[PDB]
Design a protein around this ligand. Structure first.
Ligand SMILES: [Mn+2]
Ligand SMILES: [Mn+2]
Ligand SMILES: [Mn+2]
Ligand SMILES: [Mn+2]
Ligand SMILES: [Mn+2]
Ligand SMILES: [Mn+2]
Ligand code: NA
Length: 326
DNA sequence: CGGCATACG
DNA sequence: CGTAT
DNA sequence: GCCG
């Protein structure tokens, strides 16, 4: 029987039920736009279950016994198997609410709450937002100005170039400091919508104060189109053939003692980390975050030298990043 | 029925 | 409120 | 929306 938590099963990047999972993820997204985090989670988990199957679902009976498939998600699959389309999914796709909330929430600096308020105010398009910039944060003005570039997929070739320039700035800010690619690209994705880096130093404590020094140096190189500590959400100026494009880059610093936990957290997927933390607390009674793993009975933190250590601590079989695509 | 991950800027 | 996996 |  397939386990109920996504951290208990390998989930590869590409799989055998793409259309089915994409349909359920539409309904998950729509649930989020309406504030129903519980329904979002169920649809997300049901989608991830299908991503973990070893072959295509061809018949409804193949759902029997799969975790997170009840009446609703089963009916969605049933209709896709019978008619190739699910009326509910298509109604969501076409709805003005879904399209506008998707458009607005995809803006850097705009969340569900902001998008929803704007929708209730009658706003529908990006130019509607541009007409009244007085009500925008600096972060939202940056997200809107750069929205077109930020909607273009980042390519792995872009990533290698960004990593070079980040290492140069890190190397000047603190000799010996290291840069690790995380996020979706570490899980094997060939494209993404941003690039994530994790920075540390092998001498505990030397990483303190590092991120301001890195940012100051990137800014002096003329590479920072926007930025706001240990997490920096930037927009980088990435060279292009005879030009350049804006790219979202996340820079994160962790002391080496916490590096395994921060690597694990920032490598994702988002659902995988939520499931891993849920598993940790509910099944093992341990509290997991990107800083460490806490035993609340003994009041002690687990020491980890690797991701492998963390999986072992939790009684889980190790999963490489490429199998964490829940 | 209560829970649904857990942080930082 | 936003951001991150 | 689903699980325990
Ligand atoms: Mn239903
Ligand atoms: Mn039918
Ligand atoms: Mn990312
Ligand atoms: Mn990111
Ligand atoms: Mn910290
Ligand atoms: Mn309830
Ligand atoms: Na957003």
């Amino acid at each position: 029987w397939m386990p109920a938590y996504a951290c208990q099963r390998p989930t590869p990047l590409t799989h055998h039920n793409t259309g089915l999972s994409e349909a359920l993820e539409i309904l998950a997204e729509a649930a989020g736009f309406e504030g129903s985090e519980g329904r979002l989670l169920t649809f997300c988990r049901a989608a991830s279950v299908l991503k973990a199957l070893p072959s295509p679902v061809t018949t409804l009976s193949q759902l029997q016994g799969l975790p997170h498939f009840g009446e609703h998600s089963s009916r969605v699959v049933q209709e896709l198997l019978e008619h190739g389309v699910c009326e509910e999914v298509e109604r969501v796709r076409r709805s003005e609410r879904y399209q506008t909330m998707k458009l607005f929430t995809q803006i850097f600096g705009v969340g569900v709450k902001t998008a929803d308020r704007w929708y209730r105010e009658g706003l529908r398009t990006l130019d509607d937002l541009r007409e009244q910039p007085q009500k925008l944060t600096q972060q939202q003005k940056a997200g809107l100005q750069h929205h077109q570039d930020l909607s273009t997929p980042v390519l792995r070739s872009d990533v290698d170039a960004l990593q070079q320039v980040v290492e140069e700035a890190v190397g000047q800010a603190l000799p010996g400091a290291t840069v690790t690619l995380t996020g979706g690209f570490r899980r094997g994705k060939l494209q993404g919508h941003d690039v994530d880096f994790l920075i540390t130093h092998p001498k505990e404590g030397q990483e303190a104060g590092l991120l301001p020094r890195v940012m100051c140096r990137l800014q002096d190189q003329g590479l920072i189109l926007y930025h706001q500590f240990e997490r920096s959400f930037c927009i980088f100026r990435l060279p292009q053939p005879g030009s350049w494009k804006a790219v979202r880059v996340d820079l994160v610093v962790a002391p080496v003692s916490q590096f395994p936990f921060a690597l694990l957290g920032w490598t994702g997927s988002k659902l995988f980390q939520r499931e891993l933390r849920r598993f940790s607390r509910k099944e093992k009674g341990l509290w997991l975050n990107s800083h460490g793993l806490f035993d609340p009975e003994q009041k002690t933190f687990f020491q980890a030298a690797s991701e492998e250590d963390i999986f072992r601590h939790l009684g889980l079989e190790y999963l490489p990043p490429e199998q964490r695509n829940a």
